[PDB]
Amino acid sequence: SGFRKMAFPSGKVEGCMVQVTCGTTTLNGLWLDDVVYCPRHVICTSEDMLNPNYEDLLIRKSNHNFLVQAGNVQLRVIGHSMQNCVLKLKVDTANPKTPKYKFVRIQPGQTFSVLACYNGSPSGVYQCAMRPNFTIKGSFLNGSCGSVGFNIDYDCVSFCYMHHMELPTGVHAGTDLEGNFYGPFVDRQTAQAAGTDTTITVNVLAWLYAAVINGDRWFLNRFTTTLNDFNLVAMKYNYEPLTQDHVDILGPLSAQTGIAVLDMCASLKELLQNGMNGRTILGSALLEDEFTPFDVVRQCSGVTF
Amino acid sequence: SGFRKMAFPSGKVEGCMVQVTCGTTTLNGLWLDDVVYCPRHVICTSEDMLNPNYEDLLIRKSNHNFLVQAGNVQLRVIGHSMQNCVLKLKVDTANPKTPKYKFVRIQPGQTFSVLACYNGSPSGVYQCAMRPNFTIKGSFLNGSCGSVGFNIDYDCVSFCYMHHMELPTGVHAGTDLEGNFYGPFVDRQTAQAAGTDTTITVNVLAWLYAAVINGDRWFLNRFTTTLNDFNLVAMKYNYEPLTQDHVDILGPLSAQTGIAVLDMCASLKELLQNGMNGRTILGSALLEDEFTPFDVVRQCSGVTF
Ligand SMILES: *C(=N)[C@H](C[C@@H]1CCNC1=O)NC(=O)[C@H](CC(C)C)NC(=O)c1ccc(-c2ccc(OC)cc2)cc1
Ligand SMILES: *C(=N)[C@H](C[C@@H]1CCNC1=O)NC(=O)[C@H](CC(C)C)NC(=O)c1ccc(-c2ccc(OC)cc2)cc1
Numbered sequence: 001s002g003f004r005k006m007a008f009p010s011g012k013v014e015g016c017m018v019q020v021t022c023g024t025t026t027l028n029g030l031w032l033d034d035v036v037y038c039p040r041h042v043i044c045t046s047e048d049m050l051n052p053n054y055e056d057l058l059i060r061k062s063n064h065n066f067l068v069q070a071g072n073v074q075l076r077v078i079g080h081s082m083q084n085c086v087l088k089l090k091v092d093t094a095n096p097k098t099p100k101y102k103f104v105r106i107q108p109g110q111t112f113s114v115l116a117c118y119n120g121s122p123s124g125v126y127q128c129a130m131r132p133n134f135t136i137k138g139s140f141l142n143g144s145c146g147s148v149g150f151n152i153d154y155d156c157v158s159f160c161y162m163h164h165m166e167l168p169t170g171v172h173a174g175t176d177l178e179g180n181f182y183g184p185f186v187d188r189q190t191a192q193a194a195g196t197d198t199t200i201t202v203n204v205l206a207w208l209y210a211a212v213i214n215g216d217r218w219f220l221n222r223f224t225t226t227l228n229d230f231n232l233v234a235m236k237y238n239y240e241p242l243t244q245d246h247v248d249i250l251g252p253l254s255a256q257t258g259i260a261v262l263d264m265c266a267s268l269k270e271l272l273q274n275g276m277n278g279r280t281i282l283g284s285a286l287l288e289d290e291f292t293p294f295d296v297v298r299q300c301s302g303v304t305f
Numbered sequence: 306s307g308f309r310k311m312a313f314p315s316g317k318v319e320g321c322m323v324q325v326t327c328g329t330t331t332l333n334g335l336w337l338d339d340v341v342y343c344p345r346h347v348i349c350t351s352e353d354m355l356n357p358n359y360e361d362l363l364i365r366k367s368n369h370n371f372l373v374q375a376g377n378v379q380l381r382v383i384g385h386s387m388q389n390c391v392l393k394l395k396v397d398t399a400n401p402k403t404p405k406y407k408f409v410r411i412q413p414g415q416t417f418s419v420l421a422c423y424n425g426s427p428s429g430v431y432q433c434a435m436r437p438n439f440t441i442k443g444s445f446l447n448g449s450c451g452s453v454g455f456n457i458d459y460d461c462v463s464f465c466y467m468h469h470m471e472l473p474t475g476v477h478a479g480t481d482l483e484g485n486f487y488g489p490f491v492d493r494q495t496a497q498a499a500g501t502d503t504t505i506t507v508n509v510l511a512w513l514y515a516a517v518i519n520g521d522r523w524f525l526n527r528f529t530t531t532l533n534d535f536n537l538v539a540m541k542y543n544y545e546p547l548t549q550d551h552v553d554i555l556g557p558l559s560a561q562t563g564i565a566v567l568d569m570c571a572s573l574k575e576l577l578q579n580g581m582n583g584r585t586i587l588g589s590a591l592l593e594d595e596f597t598p599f600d601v602v603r604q605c606s607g608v609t610f
Pocket of ligand 1: 027041044049140141142143144145146164165166167168172186187188189190191192306
């Protein structure tokens with residue numbers, strides 16, 4: 001076929017989104033069993049987010065101060081607690097649409113689908129990678145907080161991300177579903193540095209394998225290299241160094257296409273220091289690093305759920 | 306925020322996908338009310354697709370020759386008919402998950418979401434434009450036929466596409482939900498020409514507006530132009546000519562950003578004949594034409610469903 005950035009089907013996550021209102025602040029919550037999960041800054045006014053003391057702010061809130069709405073039907077809140085940067089609301093009704101689910105903390109370079117939501121209603125779905133510097137390059141307007149990132153394994157939804165804020169550079173930051181931020185970020189309206197981002201080398205190689213499978217072969221060169229030699233050029237171009245663990249993850253793709261990983265590194269090497277000369281690869285004029293080796297295999301093998 | 310290629314949430318379409326088996330051929334069908342829709346080449350063997358006589362082939366088929374499966378539950382087929390290149394199977398049960406829906410035939414340049422499916426099970430979702438030459442640049446493996454393209458307006462699903470085949474260039478071709486192909490294509494395994502594709506000019510301009518809204522402004526130039534002058538360069542670069550209808554569609558974006566459409570054309574003009582000099586716009590080194598002016602407004606205004 002061809003190759004597109006593909007999100008997981010979002011139906012199972014759609015059935016879990018609700019609207020959470022505290023005071024005049026509304027955002028999105030995730031309703032699983034009899035618990036609703038949402039960012040704790042739902043309790044902040046505009047003035048509060050400059051420097052919030054979340055413990056002090058939450059003490060002024062009671063259960064009935066939290067309005068939780070799914071569709072035109074509301075849940076009754078019978079308990080609340082704050083875990084790290086997330087707030088957990090105990091409701092009197094278990095979500096009849098709860099899928100089989102898990103909470104996972106992903107690693108940098110891994111990918112996931114985002115269901116962007118407003119007022120508890122789904123708006124769109126897109127695919128994201130967790131950058132090495134633990135930001136994501138999303139698309140998020142005011143009110144999008146509480147939108148969640150997830151993967152699906154057959155029938156099981158692994159939630160890995162919930163959106164909390166945008167950085168000065170315009171990239172996005174958030175937490176796992178236990179409320180622990182990815183990266184060194186805090187939920188406060190203050191200027192925060194993400195630090196140098198780097199290109200996910202193993203993902204770029206997976207994509208070059210995807211290119212070969214789909215007929216794009218012009219970049220295949222006549223050289224080879226070593227891991228240390230390639231990593232010398234990786235460092236110069238802000239690419240993650242490649243390890244034997246990464247070569248092993250690329251192994252299935254190597255063995256299907258007959259191109260040794262160190263040969264694919266030599267092709268990438270020449271691309272890095274000679275550019276693309278105005279050509280394209282899989283329809284892009286840049287090297288794409290937001291497909292994992294697993295994503296490539298899924299798309300080229302037609303995995304279903 | 307930022308700007309990504311965004312698909313509609315797919316939950317409403319997920320509830321409509323089934324598996325259709327005739328003989329040893331299996332593909333995807335769309336179950337709406339008590340009718341299942343699927344490509345008519347479900348009735349073909351491998352040898353049949355070289356030169357099929359679909360009327361002759363279908364006459365040998367009875368209702369009970371069609372196996373329709375949703376999950377581990379099956380539908381009983383009580384009628385069949387062929388409309389253009391689609392087959393309609395009447396079943397004894399109306400889909401309890403049928404959304405409010407409509408069948409629409411889209412225009413070239415319009416966009417839609419694709420729910421790629423295998424064996425009746427959803428695999429992923431991505432966003433597509435109908436090219437001016439009536440192909441789509443999808444991602445489709447064997448067994449993906451019957452996967453459908455759609456848009457969503459609040460609660461109503463507009464089905465516009467169902468996948469039938471891949472072309473020699475690797476692009477994809479299919480029908481509306483009445484079985485009429487987009488483009489000059491036929492459902493036969495024979496070499497077919499799509500003809501010269503061209504770049505959707507109004508979509509490129511919408512994306513340049515999206516860039517300005519999201520902080521990318523370097524391409525804003527000091528020149529202007531006229532419609533005829535711009536179209537002279539559009540023709541040279543295989544861009545659709547721009548009409549007053551297109552300027553009018555761009556009007557809301559013009560009036561929000563304060564950039565006259567003819568000024569944005571002059572910037573695009575210089576980009577076309579001077580290139581991007583190795584810079585990027587919204588993270589791309591190419592001019593993107595698969596966002597409509599409506600898609601830009603939706604993403605920058607947070608439309609929900
Ligand atoms: C959830 N509803 C929103 C989602 C964000 C809105 C716009 N795009 C988004 O991703 N979350 C919030 O508004 C956050 C609330 C706090 C309590 C975490 N805050 C922020 O998203 C935020 C924006 C900007 C800045 C910032 C940038 C630059 C400088 O100096 C140059 C200072 C501060 C901080 C926090
Ligand atoms: C549905 N299950 C598939 C989806 C396609 C499979 C692989 N990628 C796809 O999009 N549909 C089919 O296989 C079609 C059945 C007929 C009856 C429409 N046929 C084709 O998809 C097809 C592939 C290739 C060619 C072809 C290409 C080049 C040349 O000469 C250079 C001749 C023929 C024709 C049809």
